[PDB]
Design a binder for this molecule. Structure first.
Ligand SMILES: Nc1ncnc2c1ncn2[C@@H]1O[C@H](COP(=O)(O)OP(=O)(O)O)[C@@H](O)[C@H]1O
Ligand code: ALF
Ligand SMILES: [Mg+2]
Ligand SMILES: [Mg+2]
Length: 613
RNA sequence: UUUUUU
């Protein structure tokens, strides 16, 4: 009440089809193909796999593609394979390794076609989770089943042994609201935690997970929708001194993060287990009988590290990973759950949840749903928000400990009805050893006006902006020269195109300060929700005469972008395009009134008189 | 709408 489901079968019959809409739509939307006139060069790898090389008049490493032969000089043929080489410093040849070496039409070279194959794994796991919820009644407790379905059911009290102290060593001393939040959550089967940015939702989550783990009843499962949110929580949990295993996507095994040392795939390789460490050093070959012992041993190692972990951390979709099947979790916490669709949250939930904690802020980013029809039918509504509408009262945090009061003013008043209070002062937020000259000494922020125009990026739907990129670099140098360390600086931008451009431009050219720049985080705004830096630089990218600003129209995205910094925020963008949207127009006027809308050379900034719509 | 996930 009011939204109710008779049972989990009806529930699946509603969300199952929604997920299918979104899946089918994304597939159609992300799938592209060449003309059927590609010329192929055939070869064999050293390992005797079959390879096709070709040039293209926008693929990425590891992509899956279908190669079709459409000519008449051999039987019609199609084969699946994956990109093992893209155009680079060795040449413009794309190479793909085929799954199956035969019977490829290696005697012909013309009249081929290349289709990019959209990967369906993430939606498969959501469909699969929905089915498990409906068919297997042991996948969640009777209580949680009834609560999730909107049934009336008496409140249940979990009678655990409460800790001596709620606040946990290694983490900040909890304030009264966080203590209340921890103490209360431990005793309920279902809890929602809510609060504006930087109120310690993740700190509080880590403290809860710590106590649930110390109950000694098996590993706690901990998730978030995006890899970066999972990593924040993982690091905080690690600080409590617990044994944490970060389970990563197979496709991310070569991505570098500050919690890489906790990644399951890395822990296994640092194990002894000397034999398996030998078969790994060997596959780094491909022997088929050797792969049998490799796998068995690997399964033995994964089983060991996972079963003995106090906590397992992974994305919501990652929870559906085959390595975790046949595992059950009594206690599950999902951080930044408001950024996920409900079927995405259900992925970890159906692993046997008897106690479930959801953390969120609906004023920050929601899930990505490209199919407007599906979004409007409800796929856009998170589980956290449905439960709020159903009457579950969230536990609230309201006092912020991240940012200088001047950074919190606009977001607090605009997004949170002035209810975001400050737990730190201006004096708590003067960087020691930092000799930077702010336009307004008392306001560590400014919007740096940048004339320019966006370009469409390699991908075809994303944008970049070369002028802003240039200024981002200048500003970064200025900050570094003022005394900021690389790791105290973060650069965020809403677009992937701009993110990638910045990586190449700052980190992989020959720049004099390349080694410094490489220690500087660059990321999309969306990925960075949940993370914080001392100093943030935001590149807005959009800059055009009559093409709009795209998803910059979403207030949630600006909110996240404005609330990542502790000590200072510098915004780089073009007020001309931004001003056309009421929200950005208001942020621009706000900065103008604060005298931090500026122009000119960095060492000699002047207010921008420039007028905008 | 071009972002999250695999
Ligand atoms: N009770 C507290 N005392 C001191 N610092 C705190 C406290 N609670 C949170 N913080 C800090 O403020 C920041 C934001 O916490 P975080 O958990 O990331 O916010 P949120 O999860 O709500 O976005 C961190 O740097 C963190 O250590
Ligand atoms: F709510 Al946050 F970093 F997770 F501000
Ligand atoms: Mg958080
Ligand atoms: Mg460089």
């Amino acid at each position: 009440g009011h939204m109710r489901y008779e049972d989990a079968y009806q529930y699946q019959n509603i969300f199952g089809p929604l997920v299918k809409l979104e899946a089918d739509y994304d597939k159609k939307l992300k799938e592209s193909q060449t003309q059927d006139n590609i010329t192929v060069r055939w070869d064999l790898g050293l390992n005797k796999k079959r390879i096709a090389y070709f040039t293209l008049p926008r693929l990425m490493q590891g992509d899956e593609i279908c190669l079709r032969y459409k000519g008449d000089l051999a039987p019609l043929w199609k084969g699946i394979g994956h990109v093992i080489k893209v155009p680079d410093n060795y040449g413009d040849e794309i190479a793909i390794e085929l799954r199956s070496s035969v019977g490829a039409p290696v005697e012909v070279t013309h009249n081929f076609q290349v289709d990019f194959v959209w990967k369906s794994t993430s939606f498969d796991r959501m469909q699969s989770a929905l089915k498990t919820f409906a068919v297997d009644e042991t996948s969640v407790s009777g209580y949680i089943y009834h609560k999730l379905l909107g049934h009336e059911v008496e409140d249940v009290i979990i009678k655990c042994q409460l800790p001596k102290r709620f606040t946990a060593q290694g983490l900040p001393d909890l304030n009264h609201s966080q203590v209340y939040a921890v103490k209360t959550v431990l005793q309920r089967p279902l809890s929602l935690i809510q609060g504006p940015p930087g109120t310690g939702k993740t700190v509080t989550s880590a403290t809860i997970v710590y106590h649930l783990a110390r109950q000694g009843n098996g590993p706690v499962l901990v998730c978030a929708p995006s890899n970066i949110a999972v990593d924040q929580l993982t690091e905080k949990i690690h600080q409590t001194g617990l044994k944490v295993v970060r389970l990563c996507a197979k496709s991310r095994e070569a991505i570098d993060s500050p919690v890489s040392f906790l990644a399951l795939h890395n822990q296994i390789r640092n194990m002894d287990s000397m034999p398996e460490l030998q078969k790994l050093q060997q596959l780094k070959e491909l022997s088929s009988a050797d792969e049998k012992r490799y796998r068995a041993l690997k399964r033995t190692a994964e089983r060991e590290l996972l079963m003995n972990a106090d906590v397992i951390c992974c994305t919501c979709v990652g929870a559906g990973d085959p390595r975790l099947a046949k595992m059950q979790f009594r206690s599950i916490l999902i951080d930044e759950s408001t950024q996920a669709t409900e079927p995405e949250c259900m992925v970890p939930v159906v692993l046997g949840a008897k106690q479930l904690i959801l953390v969120g802020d609906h004023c920050q980013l929601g899930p990505v749903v490209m199919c407007k029809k599906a979004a409007k039918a409800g796929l856009s509504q998170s589980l956290f928000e449905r439960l709020v509408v159903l009457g579950i009262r969230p536990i609230r945090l309201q006092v912020q400990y991240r940012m200088h009061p001047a950074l919190s003013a606009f977001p607090s008043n605009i997004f949170y009805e002035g209810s975001l209070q400050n737990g730190v002062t201006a004096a708590d937020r003067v960087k020691k050893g930092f000799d930077f000259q702010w336009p307004q000494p008392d306001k560590p922020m400014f919007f740096y006006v940048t004339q320019g125009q966006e370009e469409i990026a390699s991908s075809g739907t994303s944008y970049l902006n070369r002028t802003e990129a240039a200024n981002v670099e200048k500003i970064t140098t200025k900050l570094l020269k003022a005394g900021a360390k690389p790791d105290q600086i973060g650069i965020i931008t809403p677009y992937e195109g701009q993110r990638s451009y910045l990586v190449q431009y700052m980190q992989f050219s020959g720049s004099l300060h390349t080694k410094l720049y490489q220690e500087v985080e660059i990321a999309s705004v969306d990925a960075f929700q949940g993370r914080e830096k001392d100093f943030i630089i935001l590149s807005c990218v959009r800059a055009n005469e009559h093409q709009g600003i795209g998803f910059l129209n979403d207030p949630r995205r600006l909110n996240v972008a404005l609330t990542r910094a502790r000590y200072g925020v510098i915004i780089v963008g073009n007020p001309k395009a931004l001003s056309k949207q009421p929200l950005w127009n208001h942020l621009l006027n706000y900065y103008k009134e604060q005298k931090v809308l500026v122009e000119g050379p960095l060492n000699n900034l002047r207010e921008s008189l420039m007028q905008f719509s």
